[PDB]
């Protein structure tokens, strides 16, 4: 959902600065779904939706980390 994409976009914000916190919010993202055929295509539509906001205007990951 929109909350998950907006939580990965906030972990990329911290990835420019340090990795340890953002690696635990990827380890907590192994509290995912894990059925290959469409829910891994539901974190796909998240990584794709951020590669469409990084070519757009100011990307919605920005604000917290400038």
């Amino acid at each position: 959902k929109t909350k998950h994409l907006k939580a990965a976009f906030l972990r990329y914000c911290r990835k420019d600065i340090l990795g340890a916190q953002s690696m635990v919010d990827s380890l907590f993202s192994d509290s995912d779904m894990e059925p290959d055929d469409e829910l891994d295509l539901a974190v796909n539509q998240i990584s794709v939706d951020l590669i469409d906001d990084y070519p757009a205007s100011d990307p919605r990951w920005a604000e917290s980390v400038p």
């Binding site: 959902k1 929109t2 909350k3 469409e38 539901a42």
Partner: protein
């Protein structure tokens, strides 16, 4: 909307499912499926639809059924499955059953006993460790209770096969569960589960244009339904 993964085939090996042995109960968080067989009782816990979706922005093409995650439920958990003991046990060849959730989230299953009473199996709440408990509801006269120590069972009038429930229904009010039993003797009986007592006995033949022959024949085709009006606070019984 077309739901994804909206169908499940459950096979309970060696156990035949009872006619009317499937009951669905809704709670603010979960859908609970209660299943009675000839030998076992089962509880399935599924997420409520309002809890599956936290975001208003779901593309219609990916709306999942409550069944999508059913393969993650541990069906071998003793909290979710119980084997019905042979004594006091279920009456052979009966189809009457009812199941419900208590106010406390306990799963209750009611079935005809071999003794002509109602056998009630109570499973603990799904989130609590507990033992399955068994209660048998019997019409004991106060005279049968007081004389329990002085006369052998042969004079006591064992509840003959004529007392066997043919249709069971339940209504939950406050903190009690009222069981309605339409029996082979054409009588409707009402039970409090909490007080373990018969509160009402009505003879259904008082409302039928009686032929003298009906009183001698076991009523095997009888059906009972309940409907409750929350707005009026009134319980109706269709017989």
């Amino acid at each position: 909307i077309n739901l994804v993964n909206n169908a499940v085939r459950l096979r309970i090996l060696n156990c035949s499912i009872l006619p009317g042995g499937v009951h669905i109960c809704e709670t603010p968080n979960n859908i609970v499926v209660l299943i009675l067989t000839n030998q076992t009782v089962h509880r399935l816990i599924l997420p409520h639809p309002s809890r599956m979706y936290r975001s208003e922005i779901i593309s219609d093409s990916h709306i999942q059924s409550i069944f999508t995650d059913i393969g993650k439920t541990n069906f071998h958990d003793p909290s979710n499955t119980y084997v019905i003991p042979a004594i006091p046990g279920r009456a052979p060849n009966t189809t009457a059953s009812t199941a419900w959730l208590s106010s406390d989230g306990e799963a209750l299953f009611a079935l005809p006993s071999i003794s002509g009473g109602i056998l009630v199996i109570k499973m603990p709440p799904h989130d609590m460790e507990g033992l399955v408990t068994i209660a048998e509801l019997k019409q004991s006269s106060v005279m049968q209770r007081l004389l329990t120590g002085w006369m052998p069972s042969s004079i006591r009038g064992d509840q003959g096969p004529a007392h066997l429930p043919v249709s069971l229904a339940v209504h939950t009010l406050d903190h009690d569960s009222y069981l309605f039993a339409l029996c082979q003797d054409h009588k409707l009986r009402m039970w409090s589960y909490k007080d373990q007592m018969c509160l009402m006995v009505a003879d259904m033949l008082e409302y039928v244009p009686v032929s003298k022959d009906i009183r001698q024949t076991a009523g095997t085709g009888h059906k009972l339904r309940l409907a409750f009006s929350e707005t009026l606070g009134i319980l109706y019984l269709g017989v």
